Task: inverse folding
């Protein structure tokens, strides 16, 4: 009863109710997991968002660039879950890439300070979280990060794709570390999901050509997906994360599960 | 209650109690699936083997090279599961590669008749089964085949690796077909499992250098696996198959889940 | 002077003057290679085609399914090139997939006899040729086969994609064998080239939907290619084969060079 | 006469005479290319090193983290090569990863400031160089960066592997940009080369376990390589870079050529 029954799971990256992490949290709760959530900057907001989750979850502040947040995370979570209790699950659902770098908008014009911020938050923070959290994880545990397939360049996502390549590589190293703890580390490569940032982009937040490109990306995904892809539905990805959080992929680590409708297996 | 609760699942490829498919079947049953099994040539044997499964399952003959078996499969399974009932799950756990082709034993010396047999049974039969069975599958359904990662050549497995490359490619096409039915098609790439054939090979069935190579392959796997690999335990793979058979990887098709301890993410 | 100056190179697979192998041969000759050609069934035709090459080349019959052709190849080529002379280069530019299997036309409807023929000629023949020819190759030698990227399923090519997956896998094994001889074995993954068969397909030889699909494949290639792709020009692929035949990729084997305009690095 | 005859080629990353870029430069010169070299911090040293090249080459300072260096590069090179002359070739042979991050030495202990420096110099600088230099490149041009295969985690290289994953991803984006100029952008994934830094590491510069690991990596490479790998010889990689710099891989971009002895195609 419950895929995640009895599992304590930290889920980062809720910012709105359309956040992939919101759905992960909701599905994890539906599946019996006890959550601790982390949020970055707008904690009153995140608290209010997360109140809609089917169960209460302690919400902790984690700015993955901080250091002090990271240093105290583990302490703050064992406090939230009770001393002598450890994490079974950690969800990294964190990403960010500044400007220009990202849409439209010339790849070449992103200053390294921005790329570096993006990679910090989007890639390196995966190692950071695993470092902060593996000491309070149980054998049989699972770390899952949110990915998208960056093995081919694409329009618009630019430096964010680079950040995901870095992340996928970080993941395979976290796996090496996580393994000593009996902990899996895996990524879920999602197809495009109409998250608030994503609808803003397709709406022209980042320029016409950025939005046009993402819309094209979305349509081609779905077409390519042998089972289709619904970008308005984060649930198939929430669930895939949960499958990774579960004991049902026990021999899978340093790996990437594609929750993308199979689009990446296809070409056309 | 039960990952696979209420699911009707055909599981091929039980030949002994150390068959990966035996474990898949056992775990599937533990998880509430109702099975139909297929067996190839030694049905009295397979019946006797499968009696040890936690639940009875109708056993059907399927020689995947036959044609008549394939043509009548679907009819025979709807008979076994009851008219108006369809499959939710199909497990292809079938492989075979003759001689020389396979260990030791020169790759170049395998006649095409043997390679072709191997690919028939090991790769093409995946399309065959999906063809025979998709007409009696439910939307939300899942086809899983047993794979090993053939993206790099290795000693000993030779033509069988080629057969797995062909299979992985067949899988991505079955996905296209399966998708029209709302059915996923995926592969599980397992690490080496001490199946009876495999212990025979490491014992020198196919020559000293074949066995030496597989033993080396086994050790390097485990070392590479950030979570280790236990070749004597098919369970982590049974379970991964079940995860694919479940509704917990709903956005994954034409794909390969590596139940290999993460060895393939590693290098060294 | 001449990329391939002083190199003896066997080039298979000329059937017309729009054959990729015709261009390979022409470019190889322009680059100073001395060729031996093999042709399959229509040798008077192939002789007449190959007369247009900038230099004469002995033409040998090689039906890669034969066995006797294979057994006598090596003898027939050392005869053509002079005893005490060996091959430096071997070009496999051979492929074939029967019906239905290939366009339109249901993947599931290709009988294994056809798939097996396709894989024989398209994949296994790569091992066959390397087996026949490595005994008459020089250290520093190079075997190149013609590939297309089958890592993702696509419309229309179906079983031929499977055949290319098998081939890529065969290639990595031939590399292991070739290596003992100081010989590289590599594949060139070409984008779509308007070869006579290919224009026939886009013209509806294999049905409307087959042709529509290939045309779509062609356009998307070119769009995806950061340097574009001209399907009417086999030359960039001829040249890439030559680069592999040369001493300029000396540390590359079991590998695939994508002469595809970079389309495969792109997504969209 | 000369693979690179008449080509103007910028080659970065000479620091010693065992630098991969030194060999690239030497082979490029042997092949008729006219070089402009860039060097980072020790220009008197680099000048003295580069005096041993078979031909004189203007040496320009390029600290790829600078910005002003980048902004003025293009101007400084057109000055070195003569107004109305453009680059045909650009070689990025630049990498760096600080401490701990790199050997031994816990992956988790590298502060982001160090990782970010590493990625700046090792990955982002590839975009930087392409940005600075594409405006002074000729159609038919070629940008080549030095890579190693980071698709699997490995001991010791840690954050540097991540940096290479980022680089490979950067490369596929530079390809998109380079393409508008008729310029290819590709990476060469080299096996391990006993460069001065590398011998220092295997000598214990970074700790015993770092050196042990690299030595193991080196041996396994060579064993895996169907044509062997000689880590003391950068020439097969110099040459592969040259092949990319040449017109002989005209349809290859956003891509990675493995000059690794085929080790990456192998497993074991
Ligand atoms: N379409 C998508 O929404 C998408 C999302 N993801 C991943 O899902 C994860 C969650 O993203 P989301 O839910 O879409 O976006 P979101 O904006 O809801 O969440 C991102 C989260 O990151 C958090 N964050 C930002 N900075 C920090 C910081 N310093 N410290 C802590 N937290 C911080 C932020 O608070 C927010 O909660 C990210 O890793 C995504 O990159 C992965 C892939 C896709 C997808 O982008 C895609 C893209 C291109 N091709 C195919 C598929
Ligand atoms: N070590 C392993 O045992 C191994 C097994 N698998 C897959 O698991 C599946 C089951 O294999 P197993 O359980 O090991 O072996 P098994 O001998 O128990 O089962 C193979 C089954 O195929 C059946 N079969 C043979 N011919 C026919 C036919 N004409 N019609 C119907 N059925 C037929 C046969 O009856 C038997 O039940 C096969 O696809 C394997 O290739 C996949 C990978 C690995 C693994 O090999 C590996 C290999 C190399 N590197 C890494 C990992
Ligand atoms: N578009 C293309 O033309 C294409 C061609 N190639 C490869 O290039 C090689 C040459 O093909 P081609 O020049 O297009 O076609 P072709 O018809 O000119 O040559 C095929 C050759 O195979 C020969 N052959 C057939 N049967 C036998 C036999 N029993 N023994 C000996 N020879 C035999 C036949 O005589 C002919 O000379 C084949 O391996 C192709 O698959 C590889 C890829 C592509 C490309 O197909 C593509 C496809 C899908 N996505 C992307 C790119
Ligand atoms: N073994 C190797 O030496 C190796 C080298 N490469 C690449 O070859 C390229 C050259 O490296 P190398 O010749 O070995 O080392 P090197 O120390 O000779 O050259 C690195 C160059 O980078 C330069 N550099 C550093 N910082 C800056 C800066 N701010 N601005 C401008 N230049 C700067 C530095 O001056 C030096 O000339 C780098 O991209 C390497 O990463 C790629 C792969 C391998 C290989 O590492 C390997 C590794 C793991 N698995 C398999 C193979």
Result:
């Amino acid at each position: 009863t419950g895929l995640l029954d009895g599992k304590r799971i930290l889920v980062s990256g809720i910012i709105t109710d359309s956040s992939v992490a919101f759905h992960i949290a909701r599905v994890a709760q539906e599946q019996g997991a006890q959550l601790v959530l982390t949020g970055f900057d707008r904690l009153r907001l995140i608290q209010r968002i997360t109140d809609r989750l089917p169960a209460k979850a302690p919400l902790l502040e984690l700015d993955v660039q901080n250091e002090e947040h990271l240093a105290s995370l583990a302490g703050r979570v064992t406090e939230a879950i009770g001393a002598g209790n450890k994490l079974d699950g950690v969800v990294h659902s964190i990403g960010f890439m500044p400007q220009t770098g990202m849409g439209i908008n010339p790849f070449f014009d992103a200053p390294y300070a921005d790329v570096s911020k993006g990679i910090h938050i989007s890639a390196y923070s995966y190692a950071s979280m695993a470092k902060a959290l593996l000491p309070i994880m149980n054998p049989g545990g699972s770390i899952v990060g949110m990915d998208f397939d960056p093995s081919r360049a694409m329009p618009a996502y630019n430096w964010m794709t680079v950040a995901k390549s870095a992340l996928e590589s970080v993941n395979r190293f976290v796996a090496r570390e996580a393994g000593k703890y009996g902990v899996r580390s895996n990524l879920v490569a999602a197809g495009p999901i109409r998250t608030l940032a994503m609808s803003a982009i397709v709406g022209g937040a980042l320029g016409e050509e950025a939005g046009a490109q993402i819309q094209l990306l979305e349509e081609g995904w779905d077409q390519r997906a042998p089972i289709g892809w619904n970008m308005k539905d984060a649930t198939p990805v929430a669930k895939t994360v949960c499958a990774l959080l579960s004991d049902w992929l026990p021999a899978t680590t340093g790996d990437i599960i594609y929750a993308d409708g199979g689009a990446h297996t296809q070409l056309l």
